[PDB]
Amino acid sequence: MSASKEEIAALIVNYFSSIVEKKEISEDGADSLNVAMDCISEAFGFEREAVSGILGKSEFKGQHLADILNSASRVPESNKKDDAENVEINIPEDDAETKAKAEDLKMQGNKAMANKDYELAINKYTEAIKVLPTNAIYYANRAAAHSSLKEYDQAVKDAESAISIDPSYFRGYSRLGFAKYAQGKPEEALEAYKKVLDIEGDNATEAMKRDYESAKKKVEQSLNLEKTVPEQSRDADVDASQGASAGGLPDLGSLLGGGLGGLMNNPQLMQAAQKMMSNPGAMQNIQKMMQDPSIRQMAEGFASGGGTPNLSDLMNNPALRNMAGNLFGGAGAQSTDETPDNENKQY
Amino acid sequence: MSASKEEIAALIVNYFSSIVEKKEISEDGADSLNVAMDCISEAFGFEREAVSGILGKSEFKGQHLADILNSASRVPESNKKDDAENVEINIPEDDAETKAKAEDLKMQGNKAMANKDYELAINKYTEAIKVLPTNAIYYANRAAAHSSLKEYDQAVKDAESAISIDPSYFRGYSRLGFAKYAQGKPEEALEAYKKVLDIEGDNATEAMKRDYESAKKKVEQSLNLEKTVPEQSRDADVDASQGASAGGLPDLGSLLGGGLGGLMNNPQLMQAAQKMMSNPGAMQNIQKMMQDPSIRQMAEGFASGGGTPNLSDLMNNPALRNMAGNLFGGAGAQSTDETPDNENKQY
Secondary structure: OOOOOOHHHHHHHHHHHHHHHHOOOOHHHHHHHHHHHHHHHHHHOOOOOOOHHHHOOOOOOOOOOOOOOOOOOOOOOOOOOOOOOOOOOOHHHOHHHHHHHHHHHHHHHHHHHOOOOHHHHHHHHHHHHOOOOOOHHHHHHHHHHHHHOOOHHHHHHHHHHHHHHOOOOHHHHHHHHHHHHHHOOHHHHHHHOHHHHHHHOOOOOHHHHHHHHHHHHHHHHHOOOOOOOOOOOOOOOOOOOOOOOOOOOOOOHHHHOOOOOOOOOOOOOOOOOOOOOOOOOOOOOOOOOOOOOOOOOOOOOOOOOOOOOOHHHHHOOOOOOOOOOOOOOOOOOOOOOOOOOOOOOOO | OOOOHHHHHHHHHHHHHHHHHHOOOOHHHHHHHHHHHHHHHHHHOOOOOOHHHHHHHOOOOOOOOOOOOOOOOOOOOOOOOOOOOOOOOOOOHHHOOHHHHHHHHHHHHHHHHHOOOHHHHHHHHHHHHHHOOOOHHHHHHHHHHHHHOOOHHHHHHHHHHHHHHOOOOHHHHHHHHHHHHOOOOOHHHHHHHHHHHHHHHHHOOHHHHHHHHHHHHHHHHHOOOOOOOOOOOOOHHHOOOOOOOOOOOOOOOOOOOOOOOOOOOOOOOOOOOOOOOOOOOOOOOOOOOOOOOOOOOOOOOOOOOOOOOOOHHHHOOOOOOOOOOOOOOOOOOOOOOOOOOOOOOOO
C-alpha cells in the first residue's frame, strides 16, 4: 500500500510548513520549501493550511503514530459537567422520615388505647399500618382489643398476622389460642399454648399448662375428623409381583454401574481456551459505517498503454550449466571397474 | 522528530517522480509537483536519482517497508515475451496500415456486388468496417449484399449503423427499406424509401424512384382498401446530430504492454476528467414576489445540533454488518406540522 497518494500530499506540505515555521535550514532554502508547498497545494486542488480533513482518508497502515507525530494532536476533548459521584445522602430524604416518624402515629394511637378509646385506637393503629404495616405490635394490639370486644374473627386475623411477623410475640399466641378456643377450634388452641410451654418454659404458668391440656381435649375430638383418605390409589396394591418379578431394581449393573474411570474420564480443567477461543474471532467490529466499505480493495488498473520493448527476455538461458561437474571425479577418474584389474601372474 | 527531514525528502521527491511519470495526475498539475520536488532536492542538497542510495539508509521507525515501497521495488517486472516494443516515428495510427487496407476493399467490393457476388462483396466491406467503423459507406453497401444472402435482419443492423454515423446518407435508408420489404412488409418498407426522397427533396432522381417504386408496386394497390399508413421507423424526431457515445469499447484491446513510464504513447486518459461545461438551469418559476422562502430565515437545515462522534472511532470497522443504523433519530422536518404558527385570528 501507499494510501490514496492524495492525503500523502497534505502530510508532505504540512511537514515542510513545520520546517519553515522554525526556519532551521537557510532562509533561501526555506523559501524553496515554501514555494514547493504552494505548488503541491494547487497541484491536487487544496489549501496548504486545511490539511486535517484531507488526512482523514488513510490512517497510514504502517506508520500510524510513533514514526510521525505530526498528524494526531493529543487533545483529551469534551468536558462539560459530569462528576458521576454518588449522592450518598439520597434525594427522597423528604418522605424518608416517615419510616421512623410512624412512632408518633403509634404513640398518638396509644393516647387513644390507654384512654379507653378501643375503636379510635384500632383506627389509628391501622393508620400507622398505612405507613409502616410490618410490625407485630400493631396487629396483636388490635387482636387484644377485638377479643375483648368479642370480634374473635378480627382477633384471629390480627393474632396469626402478628405471629407471621414475629413468632416470639406472646400476645399473638395468647389471643389466637383464646379466640380459637372460644370457637372450639382444636389444633389452633393447642399449638398456641404449646409455644407458651416451649418459649416461656419456667415463665409458662400452671394455668397456661392446664388450658393447653384443656385444648388437647378438643384435639382428641378432631382425631376422628382429620383423616387423609387412600383414595383407592393402587400400584403396589395390584399385581406388582406379576410376570417375572425377579427384581426390577439392579444393585449397580443396569442402575449406574458404568464407572469405567470416573474423575479420570473428565476434561477437568475443561481446556476450552487453548482450544479455538483464546482471542481470534469476534474482533468486536460494531457498525461505524466508514462511508462505503462496499467492496473496497485497492488501486486496480493504472497499468497504462506503455509499449514495453523485448525487455521480457532479459532473463536469459541459465548460464550455470554442468561446468563444476562437467568431468569432475565420476566422469573421468574410473579405475574401480575391477579391484584386482592389474592382477598379473595367476595363482 | 520524525526521522531526518532529508530522508523524508528523498522519499517525497521519488514519490512524486513515480506519480507524474505514470500520468495518474495530469501533466498540468504535475508541473507544480515537478518544480516542488526540484525545490526540495535543491534545499537539502541531493539529486532525484541520489535518493536510491538514501532510501537504503532511510529505514524509518514505523512503516519501514510495504506502507511505502518507493524505498524498494518502484519498477514492475514487465516480463512476458514480445509485448509491443512501442512503434514510434509513425505517428498516424488511425491511417497507419489501416488506410491501405480499407480503400482497396471499397470499389472492388462494389464491383463484386455489381457482379451479384454478394459473398465476396461482404468479405471486402467486413475487413474495411473493422478498419474505419466511422465510414457509413461500407456499412450501407454491405447491408445491400447481406440482405441478398437472406440475412435481412442483420442487413437492417448494417444499414442502421450507416445511419447512426451519417443519417443524411439517403443510401442508408435505401436497403433499410429493401430489408423490411423482403421481411414481408411492403408498406412498412415505403417510409424508408420515402426518406431517400425526403433528404433529397424535389431533387429525387429516377435512380432513387427505383427504390420508392419497389414498395410502391405493392403499396399503390394496398392503400386503396388497406389503410394503416404508419411512419414505422420515425427516427428523424431523434436525429439532432447522433448524440450517442460508443457502446463501451473497454480495456481498449487488453494488451497495454506495461506503462511503467513509456515514451510518447496514446494515453486515452483525461476524457473522464474533461467533463466540465456548466449551463443555465434554474427556470424562472416566479409566480409571486415571495416565490419560496429563499431568504432561508431559520427555515430548514437548522434543527441538527451536529451530534457528531470523534476521529478515534476509525479503529473499529463495520464488519458486523455495515448499514445506516445511526439515523440520529431524525424528526427535523418539523415545519409542515401546522402547529408552528397555525393562526386562530384571536379577537
